[PDB]
Symmetry: C3
């Protein structure tokens, strides 16, 4: 009822940049809450590869992907979305988790200099994409990086197909972005003064359905080297993966997805013992794995051209003790 909603507790949360995730509890603390987030939209030039290739990103909270928001089923998510006067374009937000008004898009169209506050009830548990979607320019905003995900945890937290609690020690959010960067006749990537300048050239590339780059966390190598994700043997990790526009097929090289909600929806029982899972464009999925071996793992989109040539590869650096039962080199490489 009116009073019931009015009387619910309100709680502000500080966001953190992907692949890290803000403070949350797996089991819901008490009854339904109105969980409050604020994101400022930033239009800005980003460098997406080691050749200095530039995109005019359109970035929720200044990042590609935008940050993971975490709430529980039947909480309310209340987003203040801010479009500073320094931006050039109108923006909005479509939460796939939400019901009504084009996911919120119809209620959140903000010009530069405007802000809005949207509340919705998170009625369905799962990981879900969100993305900007201005009428008439939807894909251009999405493929300029204006997308992220949220997670709506069951109130009792995660469970396997038998209702046994699944509790992660850490969580990472990998947002995968297909970029479409115009090139000149000499094959060199083009640069533009303002976002709108690139519109016509970019749509032409979009229509080929062939990304120039496919990247995690906004750039080639963003989650490799000193920025590899980490775990220890014995540690239970949840990996949330989203792709707002194009299919992907995540794979943990050297590992598995012990439980994978490939559709991203927690009331759909997870697949198990997965090698390579599939997330369609416009969706998020989640994989749960318990690390068994130390070492460097690669986490990839298993179209290995996309992974190795186009940028869709991350690493995990895992500490701990080798398990010779699971794997051993009986004879090391030799003549």
């Amino acid at each position: 009822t009116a009073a019931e909603i009015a009387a619910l507790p309100r709680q502000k949360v500080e966001l953190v940049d992907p692949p890290f995730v803000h403070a949350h509890s797996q089991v819901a603390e008490g009854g339904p809450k109105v969980v409050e987030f604020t994101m400022v939209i930033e239009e800005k030039k980003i460098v997406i590869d080691d050749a200095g290739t530039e995109v005019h990103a359109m970035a929720f909270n200044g990042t590609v992907p935008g940050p993971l928001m975490v709430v529980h089923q039947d909480d309310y998510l209340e987003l203040t979305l801010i479009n500073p006067e320094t931006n050039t374009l109108t923006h909005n937000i479509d939460f796939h988790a939400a019901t009504g008004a084009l996911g919120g898009g119809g209620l959140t169209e903000i010009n530069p200099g405007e802000k809005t506050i949207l509340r919705f009830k998170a009625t369905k548990p799962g990981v879900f994409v969100y993305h900007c979607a201005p009428p008439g320019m939807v894909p251009w905003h999405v493929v300029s990086g204006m997308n992220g995900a949220i997670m709506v945890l069951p109130r009792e937290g995660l469970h396997d197909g038998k209702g046994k609690a699944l509790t992660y020690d850490k969580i990472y959010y990998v947002g995968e972005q297909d970029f479409y960067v115009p090139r000149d006749e000499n094959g060199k990537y083009k640069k533009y003064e303002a976002p709108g300048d690139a519109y016509e050239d970019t749509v032409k590339v979009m229509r080929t359905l062939t990304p120039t780059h496919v990247v995690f966390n906004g750039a080639v190598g963003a989650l490799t080297g000193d920025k590899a994700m980490t775990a220890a043997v014995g540690e239970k990790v949840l990996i949330v993966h989203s792709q707002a526009n194009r299919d992907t097929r995540p794979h943990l090289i050297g590992g598995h997805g012990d439980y994978v909600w490939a559709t991203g929806k927690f009331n759909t029982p997870p697949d198990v013992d997965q090698e390579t899972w599939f997330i369609p464009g416009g969706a998020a999925g989640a994989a749960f794995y318990t690390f068994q071996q130390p070492g460097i793992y690669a986490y990839v989109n298993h179209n290995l051209i996309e992974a190795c040539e186009l940028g869709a590869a991350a690493h995990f650096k895992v500490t701990g003790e080798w398990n010779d039962d699971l794997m051993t080199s009986v004879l090391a490489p030799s003549g």
Copy 2:
């Protein structure tokens, strides 16, 4: 036996043009029936976009997609298929729902001026693609629009994964078509005086595996404006979706798939609470949704380039009262 089959009641059905579906009962009335359908194939020029782009379509019942035929499990589907002498090509039909002879393809090869009658037992419940498949010319016929779907309902109607009856108030059939239209050196679509004139140029485009157009009900915007699908708050709608040649990833913008038979087969428990489902090329799927919010919804292939640039977008106009518990604008776009 032939004698028992001959003793079964016949029902002659009048097909209707997609996205509408001929009158049927969700729960089968009586025992197995021989359900009779007739379709005339029409080779016809169709306009697929607002610019006036033309395709020489090959159209079951004169429409792209072909109409949805509805029977119950263990009914027999008896199709009279006619290839009028005004056509120039040989045609046939492959029913994915059928068992033997290349889905019926082997038994239904008809030249212009010929007809045939094929009967098959609908032994498996689900939605299934049908399409033309003439030896040596299979993809050309299919991507010229010569495909549709059937639905084989369980005799006891639909149920969810857990024995709850699911009874829809209305059903729509969205057929999605990838088209491969040749262009001139100035990037303008080519027209051909005869279907044959288009062939070589079309196979070249087909080889790029990149359609020029991806459309619902035969054309860009075919299911928008005054041809939008309709519903009301509280109404239960089944959306059957097919793609005979190429993957798709349906999404109801502002909604969900409450129950999605993503593989299209009713003995495979549906996924639930879906944001974006996946239907592989050569299959049909179905989603069941109860509308909770009024207004415009877009229904899209959620590669948003395919939706917004290439044509794969439809609308639903939904009447009724707004639910502020589910979503509200706390603060409308403001300075």
Copy 3:
């Protein structure tokens, strides 16, 4: 322990060429074993189409795909991998079935003239891709044919979703391969006299994400005509299908997938009554079907351009008596 493993029975298994599979028991013979395989890597020219197009194949056991290795859950797979001096490249192996060191890749890097012996515990039941993945050269080896699959059977054989036993009479392994063959200025496929000579040209084609050829068992027609797979009405057949780099959507034309482990993993219950299933790039899947009709069946990737234009089509030739209840030509094609 190492001692306990050293004390387990060793079995030497002899590999057979796809699509055939080496002798095995569906239900496990005795307790865990160390199952021993040996494969020599062969770099050779293969001809992949009727125009005499050549690929520099990198072939496990001299075939594309490499052979299917069959073990049971909690057996040990011990592979001796040999890289002869007649080869020019460094190679390794990543088993998606294995846990640690990039699936074995980190421990199996062998130059020509070298060999290695890897052992891993097959802890998860299912069909799983394996492939070469040399640092810095991963997609190039994979798309040159350096991949296959293994099957790790549940010790008690296959069951359906309800633990009812599923026993096949025949098993076939179909390896699907996307090839990226460079062309000259006139659209002719290029030939090279060393694998390395083709590298740069191939990388350029790979980056289009558009294969020039998509084939089964290494070439157009490799599993059609005389080389059709065979079955009889009433026989239960398991069809294993893998694709190491790119999505596929298998379909048995005239048939179905009665049970389909679309993810390839046996602890994930199978989909049923399938028309067309989906296997993401980097994975294997398996379909079980009981033939009910005799004749030619086509088994395809149901992107029909990929099947009929690019080469992704096989045949089954099935003996037996026609079932007129299932399907009958009521009226044969007639004027």
